[PDB]
Design a protein around this nucleic acid. Sequence first.
DNA 1: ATTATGACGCT
DNA 2: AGCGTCAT
Length: 430
Amino acid sequence: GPHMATGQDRVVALVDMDCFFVQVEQRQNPHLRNKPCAVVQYKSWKGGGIIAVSYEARAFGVTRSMWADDAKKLCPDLLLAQVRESRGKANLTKYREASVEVMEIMSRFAVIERASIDEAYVDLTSAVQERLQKLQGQPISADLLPSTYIEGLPQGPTVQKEGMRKQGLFQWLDSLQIDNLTSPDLQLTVGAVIVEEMRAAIERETGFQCSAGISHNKVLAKLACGLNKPNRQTLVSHGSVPQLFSQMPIRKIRSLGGKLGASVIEILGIEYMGELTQFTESQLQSHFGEKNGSWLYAMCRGIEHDPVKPRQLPKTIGCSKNFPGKTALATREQVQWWLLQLAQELEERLTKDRNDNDRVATQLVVSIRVQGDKRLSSLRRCCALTRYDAHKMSHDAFTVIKNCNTSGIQTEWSPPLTMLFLCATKFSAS
DNA sequence: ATTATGACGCT
DNA sequence: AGCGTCAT
Ligand SMILES: Nc1ncnc2c1ncn2[C@H]1C[C@H](O)[C@@H](COP(=O)(O)OP(=O)(O)OP(=O)(O)O)O1
Ligand SMILES: [Ca+2]
Ligand SMILES: [Mn+2]
């Protein structure tokens, strides 16, 4: 009852860019705007692999991971932009730099956690408290929430989508008690007002549109964000959770999309997040471990405590390349040349990072895959990173992997390598 | 031949 | 430390 925590203490948003790499290319090349288009890497094999798709192209069934030649079968007029190639490999610098543009704007509003190249969590609890004081018990106008959906509404007592959106928003607002400065629903609503302002700033200052979720924690914020994309934001209230979760496949919740989620489904014989409420905390801990069990018990009730971490910059800087099929590296000279290519890109990025962010990496991690292993990585070895020098780093990487080679012949490399990976880690201030 | 990343958990 | 999971 009165002592039962409801996980309504925070206001958390997740802001996620719409079809991000496509928007970056569309800003650069106006011919691509408002077109079915996709971003591809490489080209020789089956037209290249698609890694981002405009909403116009999605209407034709084009998806990520599709080969461009196959996408063209669904969408003959599909336009394509290619990822830059440098030193023999795809180079994602343009998108990393565009990401920084967006993250720096968001950081003006609140402390952010960089969650990926195109999304960040926002802890808006303090910003909401301040805006609530400014408002002075003044009601929130629908005009302040022009792209906001209220999940679960309208209900009860209608043909167009925008019409439905406004209907739901009006029901929500009509209900709100603006007298209570600690009402969680009011706090979320003010959060949504701030996120409208954040999203407007991002679009004004970069040209990029985005979607957002506003709720009381990171998992619900992220779930919310995807409900109404693109170019819209969704508020998921604590009260909306039972209905929302009653038909929500377990795999849709962040961290449950893989083996653990499949095990929850199999072991418990359920399908939807809401069905988890019928198990005790101890029951869930017995199957999934102490940490997961406690997390699931709270999460299926809409409660999670994972903090928005104050981290705007990536913790690692890495360079990787696959060598599939017949292109697998089978000579020592090959392995060395590609280690150097990777190290040269890594040095470039590290040197820029040091100048921009006043820090230095101290550990180099080297990872490879060998033909036949189905695992992402076959072997991971670390060594000291003492100088930002590509020739040194590539020589050091070779040293820590060279024993991998089962070939008797010095020159030959066996089994061939199907992946190389260099990663700079363990930053220290400088 | 679903590539190039990046964070975090386990032991 | 080195490996595995989950994610975009
Ligand atoms: N599996 C991947 N491999 C390589 N790049 C990826 C992969 N997934 C995502 N990316 C890149 C390209 C995306 O534009 C960008 C952001 O990913 P993501 O948010 O999942 O989709 P998206 O921004 O392209 O479309 P959406 O509007 O559905 O969010 O990160
Ligand atoms: Ca996105
Ligand atoms: Mn994303």
